[PDB]
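Priority: low. Protein: Major urinary protein 2. Input follows.
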Amino acid sequence: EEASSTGRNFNVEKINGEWHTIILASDKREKIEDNGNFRLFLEQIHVLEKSLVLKFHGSELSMVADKTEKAGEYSVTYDGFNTFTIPKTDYDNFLMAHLINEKDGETFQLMGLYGREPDLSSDIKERFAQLCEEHGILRENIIDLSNA
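Result:
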């Protein structure tokens, strides 16, 4: 089964555990390039009653994402104000996240593809590219980090 965090049958507990950053995408490419604040490598998600604890490196970083008032949406303060959802996950292989950042009165979109293993199939990477396209993010703004 596949699910969206905003969908009726979403099971948040099933996203608990090991994840890896496979691909990042943004309509502001500099945010995810070599010196970008959002070039972050996920390690794990810890699901709590009202929050998610996200463990990254990029130096160790831990972030707490709180549930907002809309089901399946989370918020976190990091280089501005972020809200995100999980438009598509199959729990066992991949997780696709869509994030909006707001800083200094501006905004940008970030999309992330995360894997249970350190890489994902070409098929899943293509599905991610399609999801990015649906959000107006060109492939040239999609960066595969599985080799990094």
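The helical segments are 122-134. The first helix runs from residue 122 to 134.
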